[PDB]
Amino acid sequence: MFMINILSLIIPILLAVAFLTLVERKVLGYMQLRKGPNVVGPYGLLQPIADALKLFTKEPLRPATSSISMFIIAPILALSLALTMWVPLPMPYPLINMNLGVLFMLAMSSLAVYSILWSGWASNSKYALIGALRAVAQTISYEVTLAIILLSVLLMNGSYTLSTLITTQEHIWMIFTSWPLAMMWFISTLAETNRAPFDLTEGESELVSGFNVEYAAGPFAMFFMAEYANIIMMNAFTAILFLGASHDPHTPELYTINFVLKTLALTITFLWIRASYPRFRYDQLMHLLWKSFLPLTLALCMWHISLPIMTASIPPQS
Ligand X SMILES: CCCCCCCCCCCCCCCCCC(=O)OC[C@H](COP(=O)([O-])OCC[N+](C)(C)C)OC(=O)CCCCCCCCCCCCCCCCC
Ligand Y SMILES: CCCCCCCC/C=C\CCCCCCCC(=O)OC[C@H](COP(=O)(O)OCCN)OC(=O)CCCCCCC/C=C\CCCCCCCC
Ligand Z SMILES: CCCCCCCCCCCCCCCCCC(=O)OC[C@H](COP(=O)([O-])OCC(O)COP(=O)([O-])OC[C@@H](COC(=O)CCCCCCCCCCCCCCCCC)OC(=O)CCCCCCCCCCCCCCCCC)OC(=O)CCCCCCCCCCCCCCCCC
Q: Assign residue 209 a region (left: φ > 0; alpha: ψ between -120 and 50; beta: otherwise).
A: left
The interface mask with ligand Z, positions 54-73, x = CB under 6 A, is: -------------xxxx-xx
CA-to-CA distance for 144 and 165, rounded, in angstroms?
A: 22
Residue pair 150/217 in contact by the 8 Å Cβ criterion: no
Cβ distance to ligand Y smaller for residue 43 or 290: 290
Helix, strand, or coil (residue 279): coil
Q: Map the footprint of ligand X across residues 81-110, applying CB under 6 A.
A: 98-100, 104
Of 171, 178, 139, the C-alpha closest to 156 is 178
Residue 258 binds ligand X, judged by CB under 6 A: yes
Cβ of 32: how many Cβ atoms within 10 Å? 10
Residue 236 as a binder of ligand X (CB under 6 A): the answer is no
Which of 13, 16, 74, 77 contacts ligand Z by CB under 6 A? 77
Spatial distance between the Cα atoms of 156 and 307, rounded to a whole number of angstroms: 9
Q: Which of 3, 33, 42, 57 binds ligand X (CB under 6 A)?
A: 57
Residue 298 lies near ligand Y (rule: CB under 6 A):
yes
Cα–Cα distance measured from residue 96 to residue 93, given in angstroms and rounded to the nearest whole number: 9
Residue 201 near ligand X by CB under 6 A:
no
Choosing from 65, 176, 204, 246, the residue that interacts with other proteins (CB under 8 A) is 65
Query: In what helix (H) or strand (E) does residue 164 lie, and over which residues does it extend?
Result: helix 162-168
- Contacts with ligand X by CB under 6 A lie at 52-53, 56-57, 73, 76-77, 80, 98-100, 104, 169-173, 175-176, 179, 243-246, 258, 261-262, 265
- Contacts with ligand Z by CB under 6 A lie at 67-70, 72-73, 77, 111
- Contacts with ligand Y by CB under 6 A lie at 62, 68, 72, 291, 295, 298-299
